[PDB]
């Protein structure tokens, strides 16, 4: 009616928006993690061969 088909909707799309926002934040922090891990891996690669 005026509540059954109104509030449940807005709540559902809020849930969907929060899900995709969690996804986007995960994308941001995961790209940060990817670049940082790559940089640290190459640095670890270089330091041991510098020891050699």
């Amino acid at each position: 009616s005026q509540k059954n088909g109104i509030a449940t909707l807005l709540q559902a799309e809020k849930e969907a928006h929060e899900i995709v926002s969690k996804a986007r934040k995960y994308r941001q922090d995961k790209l940060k993690q990817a670049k940082t891990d790559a940089a640290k891996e190459i640095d670890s690669y270089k330091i041991q061969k510098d020891k050699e």
Partner: protein, 52 residues
């Protein structure tokens, strides 16, 4: 043909849309992880050349 049928349709279609959203979110997360891994591998295997 009766409000029972439409009441079934409400939940049916809402379930379809939310489950599709979840599946798409999972797929894009998997692709984000793939990009993570592939970019990391490319960065490391390109930098190693100049390190050598």
């Amino acid at each position: 043909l009766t409000p029972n049928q439409v009441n079934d349709e409400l939940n049916k279609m809402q379930a379809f849309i939310r489950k599709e959203a979840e599946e798409k979110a999972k797929e894009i997360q998997l692709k984000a992880d793939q990009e993570y891994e592939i970019e990391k591998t490319n960065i490391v295997r390109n930098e190693t050349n100049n390190i050598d």
